[PDB]
Design a protein around this ligand. Structure first.
Ligand SMILES: *CCC(=O)N(C(=O)[C@@H]1CCOc2ccc(Cl)cc21)c1cncc2ccccc12
Ligand SMILES: *CCC(=O)N(C(=O)[C@@H]1CCOc2ccc(Cl)cc21)c1cncc2ccccc12
Lengths: 304, 304
């Protein structure tokens, strides 16, 4: 029992982190097979960020201008190309620690672990979610660029995020490993404001199920609702609309606890309207939305 | 910017996890050099747990009764001894992945990362603290026994916890790596209730400093206090007393923000008395106490 914001074991990803320097800019790279992936803004000076023309700045760079260091040994760069907002640096040595891997583009509401790195060295691991406005609420300082987000399914690492930017509001933006930003963000030091950070309803419901499984049951009420009535309340509270697809995804948790999905929706509706009244759920005074239904099943079943 | 509950990168500890089976009981072990450390209750049946005499149960066990599996390869056990509540299984092969390590016994209020494991395989990593009542609030299911808690200082892993037990209240108890339980807990299936789970004041103050550093400043008030006046309020709210030692430890955060420690104490005093009023601090509706002052400096400075 007990429920924690848990990240995947980071060992498989630590074995991939390298340092990439181009001139005076140093950031993190991800070394998989004989390719090192990193944010293309490694070629920019702080002045270039204001209005960068990446294709033009890249013309002034050669293979020998990209310095890749794995641990404390230099890797030989034999090719370089830009794919969207990432650079792929072909090196002459395949990463001996390359795990089985995939590149995936996640949907808002999906969670992943981040291995925050500086100078190609890991500093920490934490769990976060792709917000409905396509930002992530991470913990990243200058030099954290190129740190990656991932999920693990047994022995296969699915990389889903590479860190690129911090918005003026302290929220973060990045790309998938094909270099495509999540949301409308661009790798330029310009005014970019985030949209509404709505609450991930299906994740809140999954966490209410985790609370029941772990003995926190005070919030269970004697009511039920419908998807339409629930969604009227959810919209008013800036929660994402709940669909029949989400109800289907919650099926296993509904079966485990014997609490119908719509009954849990009615409990969540009363929590939204009445508040917590100074009480806590799984040690939190707010409704947690960065656990997916899959994360709840995984943590409560002990998948390794 | 951004502040997350961050765990240490778990790779160095993943390379140490093994599966230990004795008869019908299987749990996790920690393999460092040619010794595998595990909870001594691996020798017990569920019936033995009610009133175990470990020295007597151990007489019936030989080296060949302890099955140690690293990955999917069997290790040869050439010696076994009980030290307090842990068994040390001497194996014929030194762990090739043994990191630089120390065994430390932490104080209440100190934080560490846990690598939750099942069958010698890592499932996840999370951060927690040694509570003032010597329990930890982890996430552990049956078979998680032998999972360890640790801190990392550059390349040295300081192991501080090994999981042994879940109390009837869902809280957890365990030992240091010398086998000595934290607090008054015993490895027996008997009535063991925890004492008061007080709030770790110095950690709350450190997290209020992290909030100021990351731009959350609404709670800063125009007041100051004294250690004695603050402590009168802290006692009433089940917070640990703040000492001059804690004020000294907060010195670097006080210098970074320009907010005197006693001024932050006065802000915390108003938060305790007035509540949050539906507001949040670093995305939390309650005051967080599982970040030490060292963790705040580390996360806000980017130590790898
Ligand atoms: C890896 C550091 C970095 O590049 N960060 C930035 O956000 C850049 C600063 C200048 O503006 C800018 C525009 C676009 C892009 Cl793609 C990147 C930047 C950065 C990333 N995460 C956190 C940070 C904290 C503090 C400073 C810089 C940060
Ligand atoms: C590793 C599983 C385990 O032994 N757990 C226990 O708490 C044991 C169950 C019987 O009572 C008991 C008394 C003393 C000791 Cl030292 C251990 C036990 C265990 C540990 N953490 C979480 C658990 C969750 C669910 C079942 C058992 C758990």
């Amino acid at each position: 029992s007990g429920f924690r914001k848990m990240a995947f074991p980071s060992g498989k990803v630590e074995g991939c982190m390298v340092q990439v320097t181009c001139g005076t800019t140093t950031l993190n790279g991800l070394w998989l097979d004989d390719v090192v992936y990193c944010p293309r803004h490694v070629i920019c000076t702080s002045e270039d960020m204001l209005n960068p023309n990446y294709e033009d700045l890249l013309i002034r760079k050669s293979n020998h201008n990209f310095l890749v260091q794995a641990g404390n040994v230099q890797l030989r760069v034999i090719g370089h190309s830009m794919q969207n907002c990432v650079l792929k640096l072909k090196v002459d040595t395949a990463n001996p620690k390359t795990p089985k891997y995939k590149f995936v583009r996640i949907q808002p509401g999906q969670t992943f672990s981040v291995l925050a790195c500086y100078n190609g060295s890991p500093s920490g691991v934490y769990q976060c979610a792709m917000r409905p406005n396509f930002t992530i609420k991470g913990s990243f300082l200058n030099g954290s660029c190129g740190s990656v987000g991932f999920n693990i399914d047994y022995d296969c690492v699915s990389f889903c995020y590479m860190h690129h930017m911090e918005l003026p509001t302290g929220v973060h933006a990045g790309t998938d490993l094909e270099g495509n930003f999540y949301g409308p963000f661009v790798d330029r030091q310009t005014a970019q404001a985030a949209g509404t950070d709505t609450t991930i309803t299906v994740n809140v419901l999954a966490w209410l199920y985790a609370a029941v499984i772990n003995g926190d049951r005070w919030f269970l009420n004697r009511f039920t609702t419908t998807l339409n009535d629930f969604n009227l309340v959810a919209m008013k509270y800036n929660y994402e609309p709940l669909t029949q697809d989400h109800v289907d995804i919650l099926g296993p948790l509904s079966a485990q606890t014997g609490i119908a999905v719509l009954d849990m929706c009615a409990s969540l509706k009363e929590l939204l309207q009445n508040g917590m009244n100074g009480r806590t759920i799984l040690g939190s005074a707010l409704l947690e939305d960065e656990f997916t239904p899959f994360d709840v099943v995984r943590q409560c079943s002990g998948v390794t």
